[PDB]
Amino acid sequence: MNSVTVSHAPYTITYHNDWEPVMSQLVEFYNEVASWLLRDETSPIPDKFFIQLKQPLRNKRVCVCGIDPYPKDGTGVPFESPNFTKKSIKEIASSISRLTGVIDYKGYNLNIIDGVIPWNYYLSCKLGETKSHAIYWDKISKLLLQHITKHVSVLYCLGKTDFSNIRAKLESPVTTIVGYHPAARDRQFEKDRSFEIINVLLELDNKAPINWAQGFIY
Amino acid sequence: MNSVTVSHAPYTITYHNDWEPVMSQLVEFYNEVASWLLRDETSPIPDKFFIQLKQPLRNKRVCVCGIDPYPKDGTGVPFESPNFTKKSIKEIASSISRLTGVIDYKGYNLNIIDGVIPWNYYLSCKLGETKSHAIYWDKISKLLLQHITKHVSVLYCLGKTDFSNIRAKLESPVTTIVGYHPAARDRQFEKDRSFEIINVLLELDNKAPINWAQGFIY
Ligand SMILES: O=c1cc[nH]c(=O)[nH]1
Ligand SMILES: O=c1cc[nH]c(=O)[nH]1
Ligand SMILES: [Cl-]
Ligand SMILES: [Cl-]
Ligand SMILES: [Cl-]
Ligand SMILES: [K+]
Ligand SMILES: [K+]
């Protein structure tokens, strides 16, 4: 676990060694755009922007990727809602409940699942405004996700319109699924088969399925 | 069925209307390289290069794709061996035999199966030399396979090394699986569950299964 310093808040970024190859470019890129980010109140707060860089990558086989943090109360862990109030994670838990038979739970967290790294393409938004920092994270977003696709077997992105151009953006050889976002119109998410498809493709790729029930909190 | 003219042999390419949108570009790319390509004796003969363009695409939900034709005796139909002598198709048949329970058969052809189009990424080779014509087919190969992946639900490529970067070339929402080639050492093809898993993937995509037993000749 090393760290590097950046000129603007949060001033230091702690990271796992698996990220070493991109940290130099990340410092340079972040120093360029950070003033744009910090003039607004943000979700998450700046000290939590990069908290997922503490996660290893070599033991990951699925990236679960949303476009950017919750408009409010983002923790720096994508989808995480400590009090289980956010619609997105509740919808995800409901789907996993249906697939796993786990009916009694108090919460759900993608970040405690073996082999899964939850990710947000953009690492912040202006408080209460989705995708408001897209232009500023852009170069960093491509850099960091491309780095993740060097490790994982499956990239699962949520939001058909949000991720409309993801394949041209990454130019990756990795398996990529773009599914419905939890708030997609007409409850399309609950019929989405992506969690099942991911496991079929992993086992095809000679990897263990994801045990999605590990995400539950009791 | 319409046809177009090319400047060198086979001179006329007849095609089903489903291929209409790539034909002008095909003519242009083929005219650019045919003079160099036709320095060699080929598998298949030039009059059979394009015979699969006679197939419709709108009723196809799976493409089974090899790298290029048999080094000798290619017929223009990928994997096809009229006398059932070639190793690849014998291994394919054996795999489908175990999957289906069909024990007595005299041959197997991937081209007589409802919903399947068998394909070769490169449409010829120099006689007796595998992948020898990749230099000539390059642009055509991308053009044609990309068009197929706008119609099929699953793309099944044979050759882990040959197709390792294929999802970056296609940049497609199609579900692409890359499996072992029939002649993979330590008999890895025999362990491969791709043919079986194709129907699982199709079901998740709300499509009908393939009846792989239609491929048998008796
Ligand atoms: O972190 C989050 C939360 C909701 N939606 C996302 O895309 N990411
Ligand atoms: O047509 C063929 C024959 C052998 N191998 C392939 O990949 N395709
Ligand atoms: Cl969506
Ligand atoms: Cl063979
Ligand atoms: Cl192989
Ligand atoms: K969001
Ligand atoms: K071949």
Numbering used by the authors:
A (entry chain F), B (entry chain A): 1 to 218
Which sentences from the paper describe this structure?
The crystal structure of the uracil complex of Vaccinia virus uracil DNA glycosylase (D4) was determined at 2.03 Å resolution. One uracil molecule was located in the active-site pocket in each of the 12 noncrystallographic symmetry-related D4 subunits. The structure of the D4 molecules in the complex is nearly identical to the structure of the free enzyme described previously. The uracil ring in D4 is positioned nearly perpendicular to the aromatic ring of Tyr70, with the C5 atom of uracil at a distance of less than 4.0 Å from all atoms of the tyrosine ring. The OD1 and ND2 atoms of the side chain of Asn120 show hydrogen bonds to the N3 and O4 atoms of uracil. The O2 and O4 atoms of uracil form hydrogen bonds to the peptide N atoms of Ile67 and Phe79. As noticed in E. coli and human UNG, a conserved water molecule is observed at a distance of 2.9–3.2 Å from the O4 atom of uracil. However, the position of the side chain of His181 varies in different subunits. As a result of this movement, the distance between the NE2 atom of His181 and the O2 atom of uracil varies from 2.8 to 4.8 Å in different subunits. Nevertheless, the structure of the complex presented here reveals that despite the differences in the characteristic motifs, the architecture of the uracil-binding pocket and the interactions of the amino-acid residues with uracil are conserved in D4.
